[PDB]
Nucleic acid binder design. Structure first.
Lengths: 57, 58
DNA sequence: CCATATATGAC
DNA sequence: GTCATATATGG
């Protein structure tokens, strides 16, 4: 149990990464992670966050 | 650890329960569970499923 | 409890 | 990679 918290800064960085990869449907967890370059950030962190981002109305 | 499986029939039942209470925005986990009356079905099962249903685009 | 964020398991 | 479900958080 060491849960992660999507601070506005992190989220902002995530967004930029996703735009840079051509939006939420095109981007991939691995690709985003690669771009974000954040120490301790796992692919599973990004995989989950992206799923949610993608279904946000 | 006993992960559950939302068969189409179960889902169908879930939907009916939710409509019965006035669609996704009005319905509540406890309320749905009460209506569904399914052996082994916990409130946490329904809570999760409802969250997803509520954010389903279509 | 009701709602939401995040994690973990399953295709 | 995608998607389904569970578990943790906040009110």
């Amino acid at each position: 149990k060491a849960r992660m918290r999507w601070t506005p800064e992190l989220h902002e960085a995530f967004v930029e990464a996703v735009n840079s990869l051509g939006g939420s449907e095109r981007a991939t967890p691995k690709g985003v992670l690669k771009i974000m370059k954040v120490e301790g950030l796992t692919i599973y962190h990004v995989k989950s966050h992206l799923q949610k981002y993608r279904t946000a109305r």
